[PDB]
User: Fold HEPN toxin from Aphanizomenon flos-aquae 2012/KM1/D3.
Amino acid sequence: TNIEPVIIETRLELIGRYLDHLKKFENISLDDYLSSFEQQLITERLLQLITQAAIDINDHILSKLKSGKSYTNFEAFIELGKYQILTPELAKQIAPSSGLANRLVHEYDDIDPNQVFMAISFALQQYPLYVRQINSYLITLEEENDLESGHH
Amino acid sequence: TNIEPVIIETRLELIGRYLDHLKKFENISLDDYLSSFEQQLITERLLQLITQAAIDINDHILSKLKSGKSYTNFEAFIELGKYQILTPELAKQIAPSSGLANRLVHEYDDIDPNQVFMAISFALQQYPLYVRQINSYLITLEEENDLESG
Assistant:
């Protein structure tokens, strides 16, 4: 209806490409990761852009569904889970990771690579589910719109 | 004055680490760069962190030297040059790179690697001078602090 699918689809595509490259680190050992600033830089940027892309999708959706309402990045995930856009279970699991987009940008003097190593596996598990659920939401909206007004 | 040297020293140390790694990309060819997403990710984050660290230093300095006044990231560089904390020549050269910290974070769907490639060379030429000039400024603060005490 009011949401613009191209803004969302573009970001879902980028998240897919970011995840494809992040998956190359799925089996890296702790020792190898902690020894390589270069691999930390790659994964930190990928995690930052995945989470920021998801934040931008969420803000756009809520700007059309809950116009004039303000949400923190954490609250935005939970609200999508309340309205069946994400499952409440995924929303609650993935909402903490929303702080990564901020800490990797502004708390660069305080990045513990042991913690980022864990965030890699959490993102590879959670954000493919996020992409599929947002994508399913788009399909449902389009179907409901087609049913309401005939084929588009 | 009310400046906390630890804030500036920690960011200068981080900029030094980032520049040492960015230096590994000083002589790469553009065609290879365009073909490597991993090279683009590494250099993008290094440029983002260098510029954000400098912005943070500049914001701290000006929050004490010009409290109450607000500056954009571009204007913060120029103001430091105006007060000879940086040279006006370096401040003018380096101020446009200050937008990198925002574009690499929020305009991730609109990054031209050809422009980032150019930004590598600019940052390798300009931010070593920035680090030296800020370090000279810290020394003047320590000298002043030595006078006020002993």
The interface with chain B takes residues 10-11, 14, 21, 37-38, 41-42, 44-46, 48-49, 52-53, 105-106, 108-109 of chain A (CB under 8 Å). Residues 82 and 88 of chain A are 6 Å apart (CA to CA). Chain A has one domain: 5-149. Helices of chain A lie at 5-22, 30-35, 37-65, 73-82, 88-94, 100-106, 113-149.
